[PDB]
């Protein structure tokens, strides 16, 4: 193959070119693209429904020309005699005179309830909040709204009060966990109206003992619209390079007398998966609204992760210089065992979590008593599979190192024809293993750095966004990894 | 000083619809300052807000440092809620490319320009107020709570979005009261600098328990407190009277509750041990 024939100078040159490309991949994210996500906090406007529901929606608007009759703060409903079901928390998702665009491509909403601590009125042991949520969309101002979804959204209140329960600390807010609210897969329309209602009933326990809610907040998360454009440019630049190199790789393979060996087919499949990821399908989300885009982009990268693990284990297995011939995938209980089962479990998990969110944007698998059990069982099985795969990989690495050590005591006593074959096999295995370890170390190190850091540095006169720099650099690093795999391990002249 | 008329005449241009909210937020800080000092010899009286401008040498006390910080903090808090509630058109903004400043830099800047313009001079007292106002704004940023959400691969933590959320105003009042307990007296000019997050005063407080009409002191006479604890030492030391009234007080009692609202209650009679110091 090409990796065998090339001298040290050509290998160093191609490594340097890849290094330059990876530096560019870091720099594009660091110095061009803004932060990956934008979290904007909203305060719900407590409108007053001073009528009886006549089967016609009102779409209480918080601010603007037709703004709802609102109470600025609770305890204003006591002088005005306002019931519990007559308060409609309304949030206009585009903060005044702004507008959402299809360059955000996802819309995460989560609720942050403000509950005051009162000695008489406290949160029950198992408090569930039931919300009569109605969501609407609108492209042009001075136009009607249209209902996207309207269903009851039940959430469990996991609130705690660290402060002592003495009357000296009454009126303090509960320290409560954030409730997952909604995630729609595409920013279809410019404006969104969200009305949240909290009906109460004493005969059947709905919104009973949920505490003393003062305000409910809401955080809107989207992909910043500028990180999206840079990501799209990167994907558009990466798809033709990978596609051409894969076509060239398979064209060279289907030019020799021998049929392809297992390792070359696995490399071809890994290139296929990388190509599948970097096809810029999401450009079509700018003109068309498809809520299934997150599912597609999740399945693509899950497939690539599974194929990468399979490639690692098969590369380790094939490079042992044993008496057995280890082509013919049938016999790899090490690959299809944990990897396939874990991938299937994660696929079921994402179909039951992000797949159901398509029809019901407010669905969360964690709210159901048995749904969370089934989900956590799926992640438990996936984690067990991942641990088993890591154990098998470590065992295979130890075995291949032991085999290399055993052979290397008898390389000099060979016919200097197959001896060069074994020396080259050992060198190629060590070289790719060190590259894989270095790539994984960089991935983990920069991931930890991004997770622990705020996101942007100021070493110079310009902010350096390391959060998006991570994503661009990892994308480029693994694309270049697949590129080097398909270029080094290709048939040569 | 912190009045709507003063914020209008002595206020920045190009931000004219905010002056009603700026003065309103300054009042929110004052009523918090009154709460934090309800059991002390100085109950954050509203007199030391407009009469505390002149006579800067005798008004550069530890208490006026808390006045400026809590008022500047209140303006930042009230404007941030206004922007989050949509009460102002553009708060922070590109929107398409990179988003905005999380509607708290706008609240900080609106607070900064409106309250820093009040101090016309640049003398020793003026430097103090600019320092104390900045310390109050920093206390708002320091008290902020950080919460994060994992929305990665299949809802994993491959990508995490983290945002800052304002704490309730009571938390910052406690934070600034703590900074008031540890305050630095400066020597003749605000020689060496001082920490950005620390309150600074210039002249020591007077004997507040003794009544002085000229110095705007109402004395520690005819005031409620608690014995169970802070008073007594603030009443027996200065003031030869305790005079436990033991007068009945009517309050809410045996109520049925919902998450909010006007509710069904009754009247409940019980005597209490209220005190009037001195
Ligand atoms: C930013 O966010 C801030 C809070 O987060 C907002 O602050 C709120 O601003 C409003 C607007 O002024 C204030 O709330 C009321 O303000 C009234 C102002 O007086 C006005 O009165 C008439 C209009 O109603 C009119 O003549 C004028 O326009 C005049 O300016 C106050 O009168 C009102 O007083 C309240 O308290 C009184 C004493 O407890 C009580 O008697 C009053 O009762 C009246 O109202 C109730 C309810 O409508 C009736 O049932 C009664 O019969 C009676 O008519 C009243 O309850 C109140 O202070 C206030 O400054 C502030 N509110 C809060 C809760 O903090 C900012 O406005 C926001 N910024 C922007 C730009 O929007
Ligand atoms: C920011 C960094 C991103 C990650 C960096 C990845 C780089 C990792 C470096 C790993 C070094 C692996 C070499 C291990 C030592 C080794 O294998 O033997 C050494 C080989 O020494 C070398 O010249 C190896 C040169 C390797 C150059 C870097 C490799 C880059 C190639 C592909 C990278 C894959 C994508 C990774 C991300 C791309 C951007 C960096 C000695 O061999 P030998 O003389 O005994 O035998 C000669 C042989 O027959 C030649 O024909
Ligand atoms: C505390 C321990 C930390 C654990 C670290 C976990 C590892 C990685 C965490 C982050 C995963 C990857 C970051 C996500 C980037 C990514 O997926 O990009 C994907 C591309 O997918 C990739 O190529 C990422 C490949 C990551 C490979 C990780 C492998 C790390 C290996 C770890 C184990 C090491 C075993 C070593 C074996 C050695 C054998 C010789 C494209 O995104 P998209 O276009 O679909 O849109 C989504 C985008 O985010 C916005 O829309
Ligand atoms: C080395 C393996 C480590 C694990 C050891 C295995 C032992 C036990 C496993 C159980 C521990 C797992 C903890 C997960 C808990 C969990 O469910 O977290 C959930 C969300 O976590 C998840 O959804 C994890 C899903 C899987 C994470 C990795 C994403 C998919 C990875 C690769 C894509 C497919 C590759 C397939 C490879 C197959 C190899 C076998 C939320 O809990 P929360 O409500 O408390 O927090 C809210 C949060 O803000 C929501 O974002
Ligand atoms: C990106 C996701 C949606 C899947 C995309 C599938 C293609 C990227 C793959 C699947 C079928 C592949 C092809 C299968 C057939 C071959 C023929 C091969 O050309 C030859 O065999 C020449 C024979 C000779 O030596 O004379 C070159 C690669 C190619 C086009 C493959 C290229 C890439 C292809 C199109
Ligand atoms: C109120 O405060 C003023 C000034 O702090 C007091 O006036 C001083 O009183 C002392 C009494 O020992 C004199 O030595 C000073 O000369 C006075 N200074 C001035 C400028 O008059 C005053 O006594 C206090 N009490 C009252 C009731 O005014
Ligand atoms: C969160 O749920 C991540 C997405 C789940 C991954 C999707 C499943 C894809 C299946 C992988 C197929 C390739 C397996 C290769 C082994 C032979």
Swiss-Prot record, chain A:
Residues crossing the lipid bilayer are 13-33, 230-250, 266-286, 301-321, 329-349, 378-398, 429-449, 469-489
Instruction: Please name the InterPro entries in this protein's record.
Output: WLS-like_TM, WLS_GOLD, Wntless
Carries keyword Nucleotidyltransferase?
no
Ranges of the Cytoplasmic topological domain: 1-12, 251-265, 322-328, 399-428
Q: Which residue spans belong to the Lumenal compartment?
A: 34-229, 287-300, 350-377, 450-468
**Which domain of life, per UniProt?**
Eukaryota
What Gene Ontology biological process does one annotation of this record name? anterior/posterior axis specification
**Mind listing the UniProt keywords for this protein, alphabetically?**
Cell membrane, Cytoplasmic vesicle, Developmental protein, Disease variant, Endoplasmic reticulum, Endosome, Glycoprotein, Golgi apparatus, Membrane, Transmembrane, Transmembrane helix, Wnt signaling pathway
* Modified how: N-glycosylated.
Q: Where is this region: Interaction with Wnt proteins?
A: 98-229
Q: Which disease is it linked to?
A: Zaki syndrome: An autosomal recessive disorder characterized by developmental delay, progressive microcephaly, and short stature, as well as dysmorphic features including sparse scalp hair, cupped ears, wide nose and mouth, short philtrum, and high-arched palate. Other variable features have been observed, including ocular, skeletal, cardiac, and renal anomalies.
> Any idea what job this protein has?
Regulates Wnt proteins sorting and secretion in a feedback regulatory mechanism. This reciprocal interaction plays a key role in the regulation of expression, subcellular location, binding and organelle-specific association of Wnt proteins. Plays also an important role in establishment of the anterior-posterior body axis formation during development.
Q: How does it assemble?
A: Interacts with WNT3A. Interacts with WNT1, WNT3 and WNT5A.
Please give the family membership noted in the entry.
Answer: Belongs to the wntless family.
Q: Could you identify this protein by its name?
A: Protein wntless homolog
State the organism named in the record. Homo sapiens (Human)
Swiss-Prot record, chain B:
What Pfam families does this protein's entry cite? Answer: wnt
Q: Which residues are glycosylated?
A: 82, 212
- State the disulfide connectivity: 33-44, 83-91, 93-100, 148-162, 150-157, 209-238, 225-231, 235-277, 253-268, 255-265, 260-261
Q: What are the UniProt keywords, alphabetically? A: Developmental protein, Disulfide bond, Extracellular matrix, Glycoprotein, Lipoprotein, Secreted, Signal, Wnt signaling pathway
Q: Share an example GO biological-process annotation for this protein.
A: dorsal/ventral axis specification
Which InterPro entries does this entry report, sorted A to Z?
A: Protein_Wnt-8A/8C, Wnt, Wnt8, Wnt_C, Wnt_CS
Task: Tell me which residues bear the O-palmitoleoyl serine lipid modification.
Answer: 154
Localization, UniProt:
Secreted, Extracellular space, Extracellular matrix; Secreted
Molecular function GO terms recorded:
cytokine activity; frizzled binding; receptor ligand activity
Q: Report the GO terms under cellular component.
A: collagen-containing extracellular matrix; extracellular region; extracellular space
Q: How is it modified after translation?
A: Palmitoleoylation is required for efficient binding to frizzled receptors. Depalmitoleoylation leads to Wnt signaling pathway inhibition.
Instruction: Name the protein family.
Output: Belongs to the Wnt family.
Query: What is the purpose of this protein?
Result: Ligand for members of the frizzled family of seven transmembrane receptors. Plays a role in embryonic patterning.
Self-association state and partner proteins as the record states: Forms a soluble 1:1 complex with AFM; this prevents oligomerization and is required for prolonged biological activity. The complex with AFM may represent the physiological form in body fluids.
Specify the protein name: Protein Wnt-8a
Instruction: Please give the organism.
Output: Homo sapiens
């Amino acid at each position: 193959a090409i990796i065998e024939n090339m001298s040290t100078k050509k290998l160093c040159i191609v490594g340097g070119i890849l290094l330059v490309f990876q530096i560019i991949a870091f720099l594009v994210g660091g110095l061009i693209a803004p932060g990956p996500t934008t979290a904007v906090s909203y305060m719900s406007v407590k409108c007053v429904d001073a009528r009886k529901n006549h089967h016609k929606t009102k779409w209480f608007v918080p601010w603007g020309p037709n703004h709802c009759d609102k109470i600025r703060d609770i305890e204003e409903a006591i002088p005005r005699e306002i019931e519990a079901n007559d308060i409609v928390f309304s949030v206009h998702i585009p903060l005044p005179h702004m507008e959402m665009s299809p360059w955000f491509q996802f819309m995460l909403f989560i609720l942050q309830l403000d509950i005051a601590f009162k000695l008489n009125n406290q949160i029950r042991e198992n408090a569930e909040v039931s919300m009569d949520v109605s969501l609407a969309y609108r492209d042009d101002a001075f136009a009607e709204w249209t209902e996207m979804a309207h269903e009851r959204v039940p959430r469990k209140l996991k609130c705690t009060f660290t402060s002592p329960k003495t009357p000296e600390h009454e009126g303090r807010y509960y320290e409560c966990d954030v409730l997952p609210f909604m995630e729609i897969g595409s920013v279809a329309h410019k404006f969104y109206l969200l009305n949240i209602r909290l009906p109460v009933n004493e005969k059947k326990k709905i919104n009973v003992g949920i505490g003393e809610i003062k305000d409910i907040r809401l955080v809107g998360i989207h992909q910043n619209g500028g990180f999206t454009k840079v990501w799209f440019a990167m994907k558009t630049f990466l798809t033709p390079s990978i596609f051409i190199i894969m076509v060239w790789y398979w064209r060279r393979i289907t030019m020799m007398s021998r049929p392809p060996v297992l390792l070359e087919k696995v490399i071809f499949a890994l290139g296929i998966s990388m190509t599948f990821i970097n096809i810029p399908v999401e450009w079509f989300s700018i003109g068309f609204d498809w809520t299934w885009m997150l599912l597609f982009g999740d399945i693509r990268q899950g497939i690539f992760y599974a194929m990468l693990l399979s490639f690692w284990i098969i590369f380790c297995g094939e490079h042992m210089m044993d008496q057995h011939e280890r082509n013919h995938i049938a016999g790899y209980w090490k690959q299809v065992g944990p990897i396939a089962v874990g991938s299937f479990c994660l696929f079921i998990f994402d179909m039951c979590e992000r797949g159901v969110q398509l029809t019901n944007p407010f669905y969360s698998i964690w709210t159901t008593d048995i749904g969370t059990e089934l989900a956590m069982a799926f992640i438990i099985v996936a984690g067990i599979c991942l641990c088993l795969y890591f154990l098998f990989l470590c065992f295979m690495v130890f075995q291949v190192f032991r085999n290399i050590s055993g052979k290397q005591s008898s390389l000099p006593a060979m016919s200097k024809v197959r001896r060069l074959h074994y020396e080259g096999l050992i060198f190629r295995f060590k070289f790719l293993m060190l590259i894989t370890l270095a790539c994984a170390a960089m991935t983990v190190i920069f991931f930890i750095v991004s997770q622990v850091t705020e996101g942007h540095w100021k070493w110079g006169g310009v902010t350096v966004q390391v959060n998006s720099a991570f994503f661009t650099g990892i994308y480029g690093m693994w694309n270049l990894y697949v590129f080097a795999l398909m270029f080094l391990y290709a048939p040569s002249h | 000083a912190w009045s709507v008329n003063n914020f209008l005449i002595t206020g920045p241009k190009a931000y004219l619809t905010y002056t009603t909210s700026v003065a309103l937020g300054a009042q929110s800080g004052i009523e918090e300052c009154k709460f934090q000092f309800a059991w002390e010899r100085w109950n954050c009286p509203e007199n030391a807000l407009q009469l505390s401008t002149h006579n800067r040498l005798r008004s550069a006390t530890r208490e006026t440092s808390f006045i400026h910080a809590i008022s500047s903090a209140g303006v930042m808090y009230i404007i941030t809620k206004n922007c989050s509630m949509g009460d102002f058109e553009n708060c922070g903004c590109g929107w398409i490319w990179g988003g905005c400043s999380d509607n708290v830099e706008f609240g900080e800047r609106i607070s900064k320009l409106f309250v820093d313009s009040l101090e016309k001079g640049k003398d020793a007292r003026a430097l103090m107020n600019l320092h104390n106002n900045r310390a109050g704004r920093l206390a708002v940023r320091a008290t902020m709570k950080r919460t994060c959400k994992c929305h990665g691969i299949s809802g994993s933590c491959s990508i995490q979005t983290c945002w800052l959320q304002l704490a309730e105003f009571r938390e910052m009042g406690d934070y600034l009261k703590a900074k008031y307990d540890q305050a630095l007296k400066i020597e003749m000019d605000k020689f060496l600098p001082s920490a950005e997050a620390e309150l600074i005063f210039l002249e020591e407080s007077p004997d507040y328990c003794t009544c002085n009409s000229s110095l705007g002191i109402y004395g520690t006479e005819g005031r409620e407190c608690l014995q169970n604890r802070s008073c007594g030492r603030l009443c027996t030391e200065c003031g030869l009277q305790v005079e436990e009234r033991k007068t009945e007080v009517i309050s809410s009692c045996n109520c049925k509750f919902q998450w909010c609202c006007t509710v069904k209650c009754d009247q409940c009679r019980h005597v209490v041990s209220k005190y009037y110091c001195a």
